[PDB]
Amino acid sequence: DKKYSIGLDIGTNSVGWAVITDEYKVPSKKFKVLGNTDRHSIKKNLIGALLFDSGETAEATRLKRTARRRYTRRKNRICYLQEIFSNEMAKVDDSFFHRLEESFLVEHPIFGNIVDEVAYHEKYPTIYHLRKKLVDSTDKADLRLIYLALAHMIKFRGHFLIEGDLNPDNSDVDKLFIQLVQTYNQLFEENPINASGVDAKAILSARLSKSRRLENLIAQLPGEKKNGLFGNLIALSLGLTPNFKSNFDLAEDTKLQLSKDTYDDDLDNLLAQIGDQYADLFLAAKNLSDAILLSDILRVNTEITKAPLSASMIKLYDEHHQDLTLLKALVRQQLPEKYKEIFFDQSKNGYAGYIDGGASQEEFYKFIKPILEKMDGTEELLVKLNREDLLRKQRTFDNGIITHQIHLGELHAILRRQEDFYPFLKDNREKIEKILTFRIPYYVGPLARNFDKNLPNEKVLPKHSLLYEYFTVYNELTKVKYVTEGMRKPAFLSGDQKKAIVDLLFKTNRKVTVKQLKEDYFKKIECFDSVEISGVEDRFNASLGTYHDLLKIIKDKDFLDNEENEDILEDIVLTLTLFEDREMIEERLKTYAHLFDDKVMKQLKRRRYTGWGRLSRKLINGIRDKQSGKTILDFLKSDGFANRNFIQLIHDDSLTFKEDIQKAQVSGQGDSLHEHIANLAGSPAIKKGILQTVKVVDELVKVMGRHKPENIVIEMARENQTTQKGQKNSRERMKRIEEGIKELGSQILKEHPVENTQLQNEKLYLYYLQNGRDMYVDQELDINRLSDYDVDHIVPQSFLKDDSIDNKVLTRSDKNRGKSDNVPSEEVVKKMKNYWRQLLNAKLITQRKFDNLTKAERGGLSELDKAGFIKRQLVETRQITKHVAQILDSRMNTKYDENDKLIREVKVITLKSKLVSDFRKDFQFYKVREINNYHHAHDAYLNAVVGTALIKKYPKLESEFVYGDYKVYDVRKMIAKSEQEIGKATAKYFFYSNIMNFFKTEITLANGEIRKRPLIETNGETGEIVWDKGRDFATVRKVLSMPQVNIVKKTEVQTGSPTVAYSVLVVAKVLKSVKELLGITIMERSSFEKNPIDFLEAKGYKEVKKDLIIKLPKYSLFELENGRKRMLASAGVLQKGNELALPSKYVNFLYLASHYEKLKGSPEDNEQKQLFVEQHKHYLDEIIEQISEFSKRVILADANLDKVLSAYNKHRDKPIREQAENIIHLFTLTNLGAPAAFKYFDTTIDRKRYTSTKEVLDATLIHQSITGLYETRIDLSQL
């Protein structure tokens, strides 16, 4: 039994997965297959890929934001915080937490007496009045006030944080602005924004309108228009309502507004249209937005305090009141018609709409500015409106992290002082910190969970509740036994005997003795002379004491005994328990004045109760056993001869009571996976993919026999390069060139015109980007001789791998860069800097490129430069990937030590998808998407290899790419200050900052000098073998060439045109037998499943075997003869079911051939690969052979195969690159799924579709699990 790791490759249409074991191998396992076939076992490698469409299904609905889900899981956090306070709160005010809960259903009092309740609302009209008072508090503060402050934050927080989210050092307008442009530049490498010398803090946090601050900023970004994408983001974060339809050429108007209730959903619908690459862009806009709005706000306050947001909000409160007071007088007087429109009508923008009706600030100003301009005396009101300062409200801070940290600061201030008076607060600092800050996936160990023990979030009954005391008395009686004159054994009290006894004895005396039970009931009523009694001792312990209490006050025994007042009386005792003061009781009691005299109500209002019980009504009287329909109290009252009691009933498996209690302990023990994923920023596809990833990992752990993996290594699927977004890139390069040639005033586009699609050539682009000139030497280049010239890396590959235009120049010879191993030579910078500057200002190089060319002027590559290179390659910054990491980390690491620290047995590693992509290129494991779907699985395999190699080779780097709170090492203390300082395994890890250098056997320096590395890489300190260049590359080639890879096209049952939910197999009469395929529609579905046969009969079928009605969802998979597979699609059509595998030798060949000219890389190494393509021309035959063999066996499109085969022979002499590029088209004949037309050479090959679904009814149905590892096969031939 050995350790393993999982690699994951998460995409919007595909989850790829791979388990790897020691020495980076992929294990295999035999898997029992179920059903009616004579195949009972199958052997399977543990590597696969799940493929899924993204449409209207129930799983889609589950991943939508769901309010009742949020409510319930948030109630766990609220309730947990109450539990921590419950003990000390009991000493201050035992009814506090129950009082607040009753008032949750008023949509109001917080205190027991009228004095405190009035004094609380006079002093704390807002939560910020409270916070500020508490922070300023020198001595012990009232615990209710402390609780109320904390509870208000966690009640109204949109979403809590995960590890690595807090960043308090970079929470200011300027850095958040850079973050936005950096995130923007990641997505638009050709038209990046230079933000150098832009005072964004001053421009964006001014006393000017949003619209002016937009124009001011956009005016400082050369070439950027106000309604362009970057302007609209700035518009978004300033508080405006930009429209992104034109930036992305969208279908409809798609406008966005941060303050709206629907913004979160609105963003996901946009991402669903433009791609989840953009999500972090709109997240950067949100945090900037928050930093802007907090500066404007905090500016009003002038008092030095640990509650600066509170101090500001109090000020704005007072200013809001005066301004509203005047506006009301102005309107009442000058425009009384419009008063109710303005101040009461939430349906309209206007004050009412603005506050209680979700109209935004700008919508409100837009409505009210004309009203103000037409009135007298609105001069400064209008001034405030135009600097965005008029009647700001208080609720502008529930979401986002920049907000969260400001709140946490104030609350931590309160807790630090109040810890000195409430030891329990120091005792639970970390628990309370977790409640205030972070996601709580589970309430176990230190966070394990007044409230009803059985039902966690349900509150208890008052201990003097009449219903509670009935439960107490009946629970005791149901275990009394009696024995009479005519009996051999004792018997239980009857349903009627119990009621008889309660009516007769428990309602006439406070305590009931056993003598009374014997004499006053068993003698006098049942006429017995000898009676012995077990189950009770001197007297019963349970008393109906509140019945007797009220009997003296009401003096209407009929009223007490009447079952319909039971909840009236329950309400009365609740009220007499929650409050302690006659005026406040009598307020609440006044609704019952039609039921009692004033004589009685003066008496009732004086009858306070104190105390709370152990159980809640819902449990005792509320939940009902399914079959019997009876509550627990019902069973205590009568339960046949069984006479179960409370503790019996809870645990009896023959009653649903047990199961409902467990269903509630489960819901209250942690949060909701689907709610978590539902609230991420992303499309519904990215969310479906994350849910699949969680499913795949669960099944993989089941497969490895419940053993957890050592590491899980996650990457986000690298995206395919469509030719559509490929030509969008040409248009972008063209616009950057045109705009740059204009500002240079150079005639180069007229001397050499160029259509945009030619700019895809690296060298030609660089030639225009460089205005026709060498970049290291003052000279022109000849546009007709670019083949002779070099592409040089500004920062050498030894230090960072960056093959972008932003790290490349076009020289005559790379020797022109200078002779150093570092950035270009100081002699080159001098002769060329002024040219570079001109280019930089023309936006033909970037600020990063310029700084890098000139770096020799500043001492070359510093330690700091190198440490940031490390982080640049390691750290994956996408947000959603941090949440995938936590979700898996949450599920995997659940035990706690004897410290109350998390024991991390599974390390969840996150890698940039680039690392794997570079690895395939650096070591020739080339990817050719077109062949099959295996490359998803291959990526997950490679990702698991590269991730687990890194963590073993460079453990100290853990903190940068493993989820968790790890010891943060400074990367610069890991950087050797000379290369010879690294020949030994001292603590320094690198001199040449490409972290992937340890895989290479020889590294080439920028000048040409070559450093060798040992064939076997060991970790410095542990000595462990990490990578053996002699074995481990071969292992990888083996896994990739491996032909059987588990591919699963997720089947779907639809939910949103005659749309079918799923087909079904009917075997029946119409007499003689038919095997038919019938599609149930979404309307039909409800009916059909209710009564299958009656639905089926009314369709003309009869004498159907209902045990042979097989449900067949979309893409059900069938196997026929010779392993030919078919998938069942919609519209009575079948899809191709087989995946065609090719070994590495062929894949690499096809790749390097189709790239024979486009060959970026070393000039000698470029020929070594061209030689390989040449010397293996015979692979063209070998491939065509496999494609043909595959096609005749499973494709069955003999017509097109002949055309293809004929056309291949005729063109066998065209250059190799051409035949390969055209073989790569062929694979769409063999591709799994819907057949689709393609072109081979000149020839067009039209799709042969599969129009008869009859075929499958006698084939074998293959039902796959998510990994495809567990099959159950059903031979329909024998049906």
Curated annotation (Swiss-Prot):
Result for mutant: residue 936 to A: Only cleaves 1 DNA strand, probably the noncomplementary strand
Stretches the record annotates as Recognition lobe: 55-671
Consequence when changing residue 77 to A: Moderately decreased DNA cleavage
Known outcome of mutating residue 14 to A: Decreased DNA cleavage
Domain HNH Cas9-type, residue spans: 723-874
InterPro entries, per database record: Cas9 (IPR028629), Cas9-BH (IPR032239), Cas9_PI (IPR032237), Cas9_REC (IPR032240), Cas9_RuvC (IPR055228), HNH_CAS9 (IPR033114), HNH_nuc (IPR003615), RNaseH_sf (IPR036397)
UniProt region (ARM), positions on chain: 55-72
Known role: CRISPR (clustered regularly interspaced short palindromic repeat) is an adaptive immune system that provides protection against mobile genetic elements (viruses, transposable elements and conjugative plasmids). CRISPR clusters contain spacers, sequences complementary to antecedent mobile elements, and target invading nucleic acids. CRISPR clusters are transcribed and processed into CRISPR RNA (crRNA). In type II CRISPR systems correct processing of pre-crRNA requires a trans-encoded small RNA (tracrRNA), endogenous ribonuclease 3 (rnc) and this protein.
Record note on domains: Has 2 endonuclease domains. The discontinuous RuvC-like domain (approximately residues 1-62, 718-765 and 925-1102) recognizes and cleaves the target DNA noncomplementary to crRNA while the HNH nuclease domain (residues 810-872) cleaves the target DNA complementary to crRNA.
Protein's name in the database: CRISPR-associated endonuclease Cas9/Csn1
Gene: cas9
